[PDB]
Amino acid sequence: LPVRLCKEIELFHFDIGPFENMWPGIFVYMVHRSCGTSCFELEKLCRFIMSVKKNYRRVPYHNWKHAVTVAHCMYAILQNNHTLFTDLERKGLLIACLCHDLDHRGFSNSYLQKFDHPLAALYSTSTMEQHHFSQTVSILQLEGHNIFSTLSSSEYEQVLEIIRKAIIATDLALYFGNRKQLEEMYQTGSLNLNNQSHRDRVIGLMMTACDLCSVTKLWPVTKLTANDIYAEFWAEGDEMKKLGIQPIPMMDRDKKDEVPQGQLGFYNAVAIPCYTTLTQILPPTEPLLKACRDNLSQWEKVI
Amino acid sequence: LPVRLCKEIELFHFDIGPFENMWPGIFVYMVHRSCGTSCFELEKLCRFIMSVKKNYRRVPYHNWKHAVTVAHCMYAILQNNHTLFTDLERKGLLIACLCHDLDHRGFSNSYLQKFDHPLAALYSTSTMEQHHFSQTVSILQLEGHNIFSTLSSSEYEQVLEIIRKAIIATDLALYFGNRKQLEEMYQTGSLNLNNQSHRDRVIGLMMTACDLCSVTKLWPVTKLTANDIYAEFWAEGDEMKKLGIQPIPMMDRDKKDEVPQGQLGFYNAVAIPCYTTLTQILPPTEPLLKACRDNLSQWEKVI
Amino acid sequence: LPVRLCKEIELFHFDIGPFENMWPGIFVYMVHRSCGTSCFELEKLCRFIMSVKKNYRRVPYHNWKHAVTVAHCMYAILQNNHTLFTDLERKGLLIACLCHDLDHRGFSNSYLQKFDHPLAALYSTSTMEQHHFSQTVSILQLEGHNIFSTLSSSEYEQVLEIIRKAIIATDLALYFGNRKQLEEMYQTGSLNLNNQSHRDRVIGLMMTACDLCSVTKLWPVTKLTANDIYAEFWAEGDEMKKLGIQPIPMMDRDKKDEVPQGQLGFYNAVAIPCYTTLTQILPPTEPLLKACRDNLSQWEKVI
Ligand SMILES: OCC1CCN(c2nccnc2OC2CN(c3ccc4ccccc4n3)C2)CC1
Ligand SMILES: OCC1CCN(c2nccnc2OC2CN(c3ccc4ccccc4n3)C2)CC1
Ligand SMILES: OCC1CCN(c2nccnc2OC2CN(c3ccc4ccccc4n3)C2)CC1
Ligand SMILES: [Zn+2]
Ligand SMILES: [Zn+2]
Numbered sequence: 001l002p003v004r005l006c007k008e009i010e011l012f013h014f015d016i017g018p019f020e021n022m023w024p025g026i027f028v029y030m031v032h033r034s035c036g037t038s039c040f041e042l043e044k045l046c047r048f049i050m051s052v053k054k055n056y057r058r059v060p061y062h063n064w065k066h067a068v069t070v071a072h073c074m075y076a077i078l079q080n081n082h083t084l085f086t087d088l089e090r091k092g093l094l095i096a097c098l099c100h101d102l103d104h105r106g107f108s109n110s111y112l113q114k115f116d117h118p119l120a121a122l123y124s125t126s127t128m129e130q131h132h133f134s135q136t137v138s139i140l141q142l143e144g145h146n147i148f149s150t151l152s153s154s155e156y157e158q159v160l161e162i163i164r165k166a167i168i169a170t171d172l173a174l175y176f177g178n179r180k181q182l183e184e185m186y187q188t189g190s191l192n193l194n195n196q197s198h199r200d201r202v203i204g205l206m207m208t209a210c211d212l213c214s215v216t217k218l219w220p221v222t223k224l225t226a227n228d229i230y231a232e233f234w235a236e237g238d239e240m241k242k243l244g245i246q247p248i249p250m251m252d253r254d255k256k257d258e259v260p261q262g263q264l265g266f267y268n269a270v271a272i273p274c275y276t277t278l279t280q281i282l283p284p285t286e287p288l289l290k291a292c293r294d295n296l297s298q299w300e301k302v303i
Numbered sequence: 304l305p306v307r308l309c310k311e312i313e314l315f316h317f318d319i320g321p322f323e324n325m326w327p328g329i330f331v332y333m334v335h336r337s338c339g340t341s342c343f344e345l346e347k348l349c350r351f352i353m354s355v356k357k358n359y360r361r362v363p364y365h366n367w368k369h370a371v372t373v374a375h376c377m378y379a380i381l382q383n384n385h386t387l388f389t390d391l392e393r394k395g396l397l398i399a400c401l402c403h404d405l406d407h408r409g410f411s412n413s414y415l416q417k418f419d420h421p422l423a424a425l426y427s428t429s430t431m432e433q434h435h436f437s438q439t440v441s442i443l444q445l446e447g448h449n450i451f452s453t454l455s456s457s458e459y460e461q462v463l464e465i466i467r468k469a470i471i472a473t474d475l476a477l478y479f480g481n482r483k484q485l486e487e488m489y490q491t492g493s494l495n496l497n498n499q500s501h502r503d504r505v506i507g508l509m510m511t512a513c514d515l516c517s518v519t520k521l522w523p524v525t526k527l528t529a530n531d532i533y534a535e536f537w538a539e540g541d542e543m544k545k546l547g548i549q550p551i552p553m554m555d556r557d558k559k560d561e562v563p564q565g566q567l568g569f570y571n572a573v574a575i576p577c578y579t580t581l582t583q584i585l586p587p588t589e590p591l592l593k594a595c596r597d598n599l600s601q602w603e604k605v606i
Numbered sequence: 607l608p609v610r611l612c613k614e615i616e617l618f619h620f621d622i623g624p625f626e627n628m629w630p631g632i633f634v635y636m637v638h639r640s641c642g643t644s645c646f647e648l649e650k651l652c653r654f655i656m657s658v659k660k661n662y663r664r665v666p667y668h669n670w671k672h673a674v675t676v677a678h679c680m681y682a683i684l685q686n687n688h689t690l691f692t693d694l695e696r697k698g699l700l701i702a703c704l705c706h707d708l709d710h711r712g713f714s715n716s717y718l719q720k721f722d723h724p725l726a727a728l729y730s731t732s733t734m735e736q737h738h739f740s741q742t743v744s745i746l747q748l749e750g751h752n753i754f755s756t757l758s759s760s761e762y763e764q765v766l767e768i769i770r771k772a773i774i775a776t777d778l779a780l781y782f783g784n785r786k787q788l789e790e791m792y793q794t795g796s797l798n799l800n801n802q803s804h805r806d807r808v809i810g811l812m813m814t815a816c817d818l819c820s821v822t823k824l825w826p827v828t829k830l831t832a833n834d835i836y837a838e839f840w841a842e843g844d845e846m847k848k849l850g851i852q853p854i855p856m857m858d859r860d861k862k863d864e865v866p867q868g869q870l871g872f873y874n875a876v877a878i879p880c881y882t883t884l885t886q887i888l889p890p891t892e893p894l895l896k897a898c899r900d901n902l903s904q905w906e907k908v909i
């Protein structure tokens with residue numbers, strides 16, 4: 001891998017670039033360092049990644065880029081807490097992040113409820129996220145695609161549970177309950193990473209941290225990536241108006257003037273608390289929280 | 304098919320949604336109700352639809368969405384006049400609507416004349432529309448694609464004539480002559496649906512009604528769909544300027560300020576008269592005309 | 607080929623139209639006139655073109671359209687100086703123009719340097735242009751794709767050198783040195799087209815003339831094509847800001863107000879001198895220089 005990449009890829013605020021045919025190679029490098037070169041047979045791994053790529057749709061935000069972006073943050077976190085996680089947790093978490101928003105259409109779980117989409121019926125809650133996980137299992141079941149074929153039956157099942165759990169946590173609606181719980185448990189000292197239940201919740205926050213990691217990049221990246229996600233939200237807002245429903249101001253394109261305020265409110269109520277709590281639990285994740293604040297100050301500089 | 308769809312799909316102002324991989328299933332449902340489950344062998348029908356889909360290009364307006372939209376209106380009209388049409392007319396009209404603007408490039412017959420396109424030479428008048436029909440026959444001749452293989456030789460030929468005739472009527476230039484003729488014939492009581500010549504002209508107006516049915520949707524749908532068609536017209540206007548020709552204000556992107564007036568003039572001169580005459584001939588088609596007027600009032604509310 | 611095309615395709619300011627599936631046929635016509643019908647076996651030639659088409663990416667400016675546009679200018683120049691070039695130079699120059707910006711991503715050699723892209727390492731200078739040529743050889747080596755299989759070993763090698771040389775000259779950074787040299791040599795009468803070294807440099811200027819030939823079209827074409835290239839530059843400018851680097855005002859989308867001035871400065875410093883020197887050396891290329899000036903006056907009419 002090129003010289004500037006090797007150096008900067010260890011940084012939290014890294015951007016993966018505009019060259020799509022490098023991302024597969026970038027991801028493999030992250031796996032070969034955090035996990036190891038023995039972890040996965042390489043032939044099977046590329047085959048897997050190509051298929052995951054194939055099943056990300058060409059939407060503005062929730063796309064193959066995001067997937068690899070989200071995965072890299074998880075790599076940074078893994079590299080700065082190398083002593084904390086097992087072989088199977090490092091294997092399963094990078095993979096989870098890559099598959100975490102598979103076959104996403106660019107519509108929230110809200111919109112899939114009110115459209116009466118077949119997926120809403122099949123999955124009552126966390127619609128897209130269970131889909132994302134089902135897609136993941138489908139891709140694993142293709143021939144030459146079981147990247148976990150070295151594993152024993154016992155180990156295979158645990159890593160699927162990690163991945164299953166992790167992906168679900170990316171449902172932003174479950175983050176709030178999960179953080180408030182971790183906040184309590186840190187302050188009272190009851191939080192303990194040898195307790196599998198506690199361990200799950202931290203990983204959950206880790207996944208939320210990564211899912212939002214566009215707010216921990218440099219300002220030019222954070223501001224341009226904002227255009228992508230509004231492209232999706234305004235589209236979903238247009239489809240709400242088609243249903244006759246009034247969409248919330250976050251998705252109404254006729255309220256671009258209220259964007260600065262919304263970003264302000266979103267950092268205060270969600271982004272900052274996320275990285276605040278994450279830093280407490282994993283001190284080496286400070287840069288995410290710092291970079292987050294820098295972008296919060298820039299949203300103020302607008303208004 | 305999902306609960307909200309079953310209910311609302313019987314409504315004229317229905318929108319088919321942003322999910323492409325439902326449209327095939329929606330269309331089949333419309334066929335299985337208006338026509339019947341025996342009408343078409345299902346294996347052959349999907350194969351047919353997939354190929355029709357494949358031959359719609361990715362243009363802003365005249366696309367796979369429009370095709371299915373236009374087809375649904377025809378279904379609503381069929382369902383509210385179930386007693387008027389034969390087996391072969393219901394078979395052939397939904398199919399015609401789906402294929403009616405096949406392989407459309409997003410350029411009018413006007414622009415294909417002045418570019419000296421090979422299609423202009425091959426079809427002097429109604430260039431795109433004969434193309435649309437030729438495309439349709441090509442798709443029917445593929446193996447496993449003759450959805451009319453149950454039919455006798457006699458019946459097959461008639462349904463092709465229905466489809467041939469119907470598609471041609473979508474040429475907006477032929478609508479004016481066809482309406483004025485139907486207006487006369489209704490008022491003087493000479494109009495008679497047992498006269499095959501009269502029958503053809505009504506179907507013609509039905510196809511024009513469906514081709515324009517974006518003006519009979521709810522206001523948010525009608526207004527956003529407007530953006531799509533101007534995307535095409537302004538592109539064609541750009542290609543005129545490339546030829547050195549001055550394009551008409553409908554296609555000049557430098558005259559966005561004249562859009563409200565143009566829509567006003569278009570409803571008065573074309574859209575309203577179309578649905579006015581259609582209501583007289585088929586009373587159950589009132590909702591289209593009402594919805595049309597509601598959108599006319601909204602264009603006034605602008606200026 | 608259609609009547610209006612036959613006529614206008616001999617004109618310098620010709621536009622190739624918005625119909626992609628004609629461009630292959632247009633290009634073959636240009637080859638069959640300037641070069642001849644014996645030059646290339648037709649089966650192999652289409653196969654070649656389809657593959658070249660396949661390897662142009664869907665970027666705003668540097669795309670399959672540009673390639674065919676650039677190639678046509680070269681055809682006009684060839685047709686108005688028919689007595690000056692050999693069989694192998696006519697074969698090789700149209701082909702070179704079609705392949706000249708193969709697999710272009712829409713990023714300059716500047717951006718590929720600062721991203722530390724693998725191509726920057728492989729080709730120190732003229733990064734994209736050597737790539738373009740390598741792509742060309744790759745496409746020639748496919749089975750049924752050696753359009754130069756009639757040629758003797760001797761002739762094949764020379765035409766590859768013509769193509770190699772020509773493509774490299776499209777690197778705008780090498781144009782300045784090449785023009786200043788030709789300017790001197792014309793005025794002092796030392797310039798001589800029987801001297802292979804001099805011959806190369808003229809061809810170089812010819813390729814630069816063609817690469818920029820969007821400035822020698824009619825004004826509506828020149829002005830709209832401008833939107834395409836800024837789409838690319840502003841994207842590259844966005845990727846610079848992502849790297850933390852400040853991009854030059856040509857690529858900063860926040861400076862759209864400085865576009866008129868930039869186009870002004872670009873015509874004076876590059877475009878006009880190019881066609882000025884080209885006219886001196888090949889008098890029949892006057893129309894390019896005239897059309898160029900007309901577009902320079904229109905940029906003044908803005909400010
Ligand atoms: O700048 C990079 C983006 C920022 C937003 N991201 C989000 N990810 C998940 C959920 N929500 C995100 O941001 C949306 C945009 N926000 C809001 C909220 C309220 C608003 C009210 C009015 C106008 C705009 C609003 N935007 C939340 C991803 C990275
Ligand atoms: O709102 C949904 C659209 C409305 C227009 N449609 C049309 N279908 C077929 C033919 N023409 C249509 O509308 C065009 C837009 N109109 C005009 C006419 C004159 C204008 C003059 C100046 C500026 C804009 C104009 N638009 C006709 C489809 C649904
Ligand atoms: O109008 C048709 C285009 C004109 C520009 N073309 C160019 N080709 C190769 C290299 N450069 C081209 O133009 C770019 C645009 N120019 C500039 C230069 C300085 C600027 C400064 C501020 C803002 C915009 C600038 N654009 C050069 C292709 C055809
Ligand atoms: Zn998600
Ligand atoms: Zn995500």
Ligand SMILES: [Zn+2]
Binds near residue numbers: 403404431473474
């Ligand atoms: Zn049509």
Ligand SMILES: [Zn+2]
Binds near residue numbers: 365369403404473514
């Ligand atoms: Zn149509």
Ligand SMILES: [Zn+2]
Binds near residue numbers: 707734776777
């Ligand atoms: Zn180039």
Ligand SMILES: [Zn+2]
Binds near residue numbers: 672
């Ligand atoms: Zn070029």
